[PDB]
């Protein structure tokens, strides 16, 4: 049984200090043979979820807490320290509110702050550590003011009677032992308990210098600056029980209370299971409302899939069943709410202006998702599996990985705030980390080096994303050279290896939106800027999800927004000619116009397929169906080619080899529908499941369990299932001895297998673009160019590509020009004026209001003299003059520039 437990500890999430990350701290506490650990960061619970995930895995009990800067009228302007532990969940939601109250209140340079009297209402379930020499009671003792001491203790004697402990710390800092003595006395005289703490900020004592620089970078000081605050001692590392016991041997009850307190603290953070909000229904069980909509959804989907042409009545069965099997699993696991929430949201986005990304996770395998128009692929057709997305044989959180554009966030939030409540909705925090370049940069400044000396090392660091220091040393031979040649450079880099990855701040921008069933502060604390605005959950995208809140991420995918513009343009065309608006989901997936094109390798602007190596793969492959469109992203990899698996796929398809299920030597003829569209090769994860379904007789639930069993790659569990495969073979009935011979291959073929529900989701959008480029190239290309206005080169290039595919693209004309590119009545592309760098949407809107205010622009003068000046700057006019927008009307550019002076004289009169 334990002698001591650390109740005051900081991680990098404190941001103003801390060095080690959450999990490592957990692992050190573990190695030290300790029962529990309390990470108490500065005014946040940012790593709380990670903390729990780690304590679970390491067999350590997490203790929730946080340090606070405090102010009470009693000490005036001066701030004091206070550590607050959550004994139970009543106190953990109080601690959350405190943190949220500090930030929501706004702050200045001292950071967020709490009023000690806030501890009056936010009280139950909390255990306070005095703060030590820096606490309100602590300072008074050193100041020697007895009345003050009595008056502070009177607050804790009243509001935290058995929950206030005098914190004793021996880190060899000024006025420590002095306070300790004074505190110990007060303790004995007032009957107050003490407790020992090491005020930990780093793991090993030798991490002290790395921490000092970590702080300095934040404090904006140079390391050797005399006026640089020196607030930490090397003793503030994570000490052992022994070290801590010998250290406080003269006051055991201080050590004993760490163990008592640790016992009194037990907070529950339920991870891995949703807390869904309530979907509008009326009088109907959320379960019931799902089926009414799912069935109505399947009605439409079936009418379309199988037109009145009542062949549907012969294939309708296979669907009605699937819907039920799913709908039952969904309703048993308490997820109908989720499916509805996403359904409705996706609908709202279609009606309003919001485009949502292609990512549906594994959801494309849900026939219910199909019915609710959450996914637009029919999973029956393409053997997309429901129990790969949501398997009742395991615990999981159904995620459609739905994301929208960060630009349209305020619009999205407004809608979910209407649907589920204003303070029920919130944005998600994002953290800044010191990457290789930036850490070299900042450690350089702190060690007193000019930006020139340092940038010479930062420039060696490759720009590749996810680049680490260790990789830079591998790729760039100059680094180890200069590292061993210069003692200063090597001290710089040694230190930057220690700080690499550390967290410096919050965004910047949020990661997305989250929706709680009640006010957000019930599930997470808030973070705010200096003025208590721009609130976000202190948990980030991953953590907030695991805490069991429904989230929607942001993304900068320009592909989906392009397709909107195309259809917009395309449908305006439909408006004049009196024909039905186009539903992009209703397009045929078998279209030779599109596929003949695909094979020509004309994929520029075709989402995903438009790289270089892909176009080589395409030529070599020659896909004629949507099936091998899905296979495309799965074949384009180092794994498949390194094994020749791709060279096989193409060879079979094209007759250079005869199909086999899967192998020439080992195979069976009952895998017909399973390995047919893949031409016999084991490509997708769903196929690994399906062979085990028909060959063995797995229930797809167990098939899914096996798929993962292989990924765990520990024989025990594989041997368990192995036998399950052999007897499974003979029951439904086949030849064994091959079930074992094919198994050890699918064992390996599942290795580089690919999630099909994920591929088809994206592949659909690739095809949707390929199609638009084939049947409406003008509208689509115009849309693509509207998406690239900000980049001139891309525009020029796209113009070439237009002319090459036989499109007529007209240069900037001030009379017909719009902000976005568009298509004229004759099917020609009109240059979007927004493409002219330095003009902007403002002036362009003005130019149009002017033009719609008559006809207009018989010449430059007619524009200048017309359009409101300063809505249209003279410099904005040069940009226009120089784009050749007036080339039709008056004289040409050079001659017009000279005339500009005059036209603006006349302009105002
Ligand atoms: Zn600190
Ligand atoms: Zn602290």
Numbering used by the authors: 3 to 911
From the paper:
For this, we made three variants of E. coli Pol III with three, four or five mutations in the PHP domain, termed 3mPHP, 4mPHP, and 5mPHP, respectively. The first of these mutants, 3mPHP, has three histidine residues restored at positions 1, 4 and 9 (i.e. R10H, F44H, R203H). We crystallized 3mPHP under similar conditions to the wild-type protein, and the structure was determined by molecular replacement and refined to 2.9 Å resolution. The 3mPHP structure is virtually identical to that of the wild-type protein, with a root square mean deviation of 0.92 Å over 756 aligned Cα atoms. Two strong peaks (5.0 σ and 6.1 σ) that stand out in the anomalous difference map calculated using X-rays of 1.000 Å wavelength, indicate the presence of two metals bound to the active site of the PHP domain, even though no metals were added to the crystallisation conditions. The positions of the two metal ions in the 3mPHP structure are essentially identical to the metal positions in other PHP domain structures, including T. aquaticus Pol III. A third metal ion often found in canonical PHP domains is not observed. The two metal ions in the 3mPHP structure were, therefore, modelled as zinc. In contrast, wild-type E. coli Pol III shows only a very low level of exonuclease activity. Likewise, the mutants 3mPHP and 4mPHP do not show increased 3′-5′ exonuclease activity relatively to the wild-type protein in the presence of any of the metals tested (Zn2+, Ni2+, Mn2+, Co2+, Cu2+; Figure 5 and data not shown), which may be explained by the fact that these mutants do not have all 5 missing residues restored. Here too, we find that the protein apparently unfolds in a single step, with the 3mPHP mutant being less stable than the wild-type protein.
The DNA polymerases at the core of every bacterial replisome belong to the C-family of DNA polymerases. All members of this family contain a set of four domains that are organised within a single polypeptide in the following order: Polymerase and Histidinol Phosphatase (PHP), Palm, Thumb and Fingers. The PHP domain in Pol III and Pol C is a barrel-shaped domain located at the side of the polymerase, near the Thumb domain. In E. coli DNA polymerase III, however, the PHP domain has lost several metal-coordinating residues and is likely to be catalytically inactive.
